[PDB]
């Protein structure tokens, strides 16, 4: 059967405004593997986002890292939009600098 | 290094 | 310490969207080093760690054709298993395969594995003796008999105790400088009031390798197992990992909580107190 992704949104390094960083969205625990993961900046989809190669865990559920280089500022809000067969609407997780 | 030709289910 | 090499294959049928998709990745411990993606442009097995690049072109030739061979077999199996289960061609289905070998701290063979799933559920797996199989359901028993008849286990056991450990040892040596490193976690604590009477303490482990780690909260020296929010260990993106454990505490009582961090790169485990 199907399994809903867990979603973590975070930066590679502790955020400092004006310092280059990487914005990560980690999705895991999901099945099947078909999924779309987009990164938003103030609600707009970021254009160049890369991802890891599809792998999976001991219980066979999938995981992927989507990431993009970015420079945080005070006013820009970032979120991750996960589109999956188990979600009747896409889940949007906001970036929290301490999570 | 990967494994060689599997049988077939 | 101990070491592992593992390959993960995923084959996904997509009726009405083309031929099945095949993705293969190979790990040494928590480090990916090869990738094959059937949708990608190269149609080649590709390096994903700097140290695998010192293999000569015959390596990439041989790896590419063996991976391609497995995807080919998977395509056959997608059709076959559909028969076993009387499923229509309109549906997407998924075959997953994981196999590999472990060696001890001295490069000696420890364990071999090979397991297969269908649609996310155990289908058939090789037993620890590397000579018998365990079928998960009725359909997999048909495969079990096919594979007993073809002595698949002995092909598989010869690989697991032979080439698999040999090249695992080889990769461990050629990538010694990154694969046999330990980066210990960089730890810190954050603290945020939630109300006039409660606060969150969050314990952070950053920049560590390998991924295995334990974070535990204690109160006056008693594990707080039930009341801690703990996130899955996650990739930073640069080869290292991150993890945190958080606990809601009464405002004013923070000094009773300790976060304990165990990781193999730590000579002794760390204790953090706000």
From TrEMBL, chain C:
Subcellular localization(s) per the UniProt record: Cell membrane; Membrane
Any one GO BP annotation for this protein: antigen processing and presentation of peptide antigen via MHC class I
Cystine crosslinks: 101-164, 203-259
Membrane topology summary: Single-pass membrane protein; Single-pass type I membrane protein
Domain of life: Eukaryota
Signal in keyword set: yes
GO CC terms, sorted: early endosome membrane; ER to Golgi transport vesicle membrane; Golgi membrane; lumenal side of endoplasmic reticulum membrane; MHC class I protein complex; phagocytic vesicle membrane; recycling endosome membrane
Main location: membrane
Ig-like domain boundaries: 185-271
Swiss-Prot/TrEMBL keywords: Disulfide bond, Glycoprotein, Immunity, Membrane, MHC I, Phosphoprotein, Signal, Transmembrane, Transmembrane helix
Protein family: Belongs to the MHC class I family.
Name of the protein in its database record: MHC class I antigen
Protein encoded by which gene: HLA-A
Full protein segment contained here: 25 to 298 of 337
């Amino acid at each position: 059967i199907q399994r809903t992704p867990k979603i973590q949104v975070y930066s590679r390094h502790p955020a400092e405004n004006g310092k280059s960083n990487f914005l990560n969205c980690y999705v895991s625990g999901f099945h099947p593997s078909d999924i779309e993961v987009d990164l938003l900046k103030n609600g707009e989809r970021i254009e160049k986002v890369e991802h890891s190669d599809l792998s999976f865990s001991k219980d066979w559920s999938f995981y992927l890292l989507y990431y993009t280089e970015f420079t945080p500022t005070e006013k820009d809000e970032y979120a991750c939009r996960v589109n999956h067969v188990t979600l009747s609407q896409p889940k949007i997780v906001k970036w929290d600098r301490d999570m | 290094v990967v494994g060689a030709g599997g049988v077939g289910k | 310490g101990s070491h592992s090499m593992r390959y993960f294959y995923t084959s996904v049928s997509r009726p009405g969207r083309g031929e099945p998709r095949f993705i293969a990745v190979g790990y040494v411990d928590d480090t990916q080093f090869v990738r094959f993606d059937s949708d990608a442009a190269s149609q080649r097995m590709e390096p994903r760690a700097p140290w695998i690049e010192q293999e000569g072109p015959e390596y990439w030739d041989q790896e590419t054709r063996n991976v391609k061979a497995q995807s080919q077999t998977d395509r056959v199996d997608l059709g076959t298993l559909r028969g076993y289960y009387n499923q229509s061609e309109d549906g997407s289905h998924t075959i997953q395969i994981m196999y590999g070998c472990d060696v001890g701290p001295d490069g000696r063979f420890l364990r071999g594995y090979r397991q297969d799933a269908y649609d996310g559920k155990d289908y058939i797996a090789l037993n620890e003796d590397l000579r018998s199989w365990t079928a998960a359901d009725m359909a997999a028993q048909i495969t079990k008999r096919k594979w007993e008849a073809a002595h698949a286990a002995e092909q598989q056991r010869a690989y697991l105790e032979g080439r698999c450990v040999e090249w695992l040892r080889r990769y461990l040596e050629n990538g010694k400088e990154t694969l046999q490193r330990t980066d210990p976690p960089k730890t810190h604590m954050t603290h945020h009031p939630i109300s006039d009477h409660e606060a969150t303490l969050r314990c952070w482990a950053l920049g560590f390798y390998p991924a295995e780690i334990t974070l535990t909260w204690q109160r006056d020296g008693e594990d707080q197992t039930q009341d801690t929010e703990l996130v899955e260990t996650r990739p930073a993106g640069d080869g290292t990992f991150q993890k945190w454990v958080a606990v809601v505490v009464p405002s004013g009582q923070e000094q009773r909580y300790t976060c304990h961090v165990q990781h193999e790169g730590l000579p002794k485990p760390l204790t953090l107190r706000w």
